[PDB]
Symmetry: C3
Subunit: 29 residues, 3 copies
Amino acid sequence: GEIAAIKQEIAANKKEIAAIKWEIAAIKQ
Amino acid sequence: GEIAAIKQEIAANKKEIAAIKWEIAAIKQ
Amino acid sequence: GEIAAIKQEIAANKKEIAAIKWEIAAIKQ
Ligand SMILES: [Cl-]
């Protein structure tokens, strides 16, 4: 369904955001 | 409601994205 | 419509995330 598909994409963005924040932490050391 | 909950999560991701972009600016100085 | 507006905002966040990941790659060189 449409709503479920939307929720999945929001969740995927949440994962990428958490990955980036880890990366930013790693660059700063 | 479902739509409202979705909108709140999108907004939360928008905030994290803006925070990261500020962080990226700060790392570059 | 509401769903379409939501989808557009999710897509906009996806673009910003891809931009940030490119930026992170560029900072690391
Ligand atoms: Cl999102």
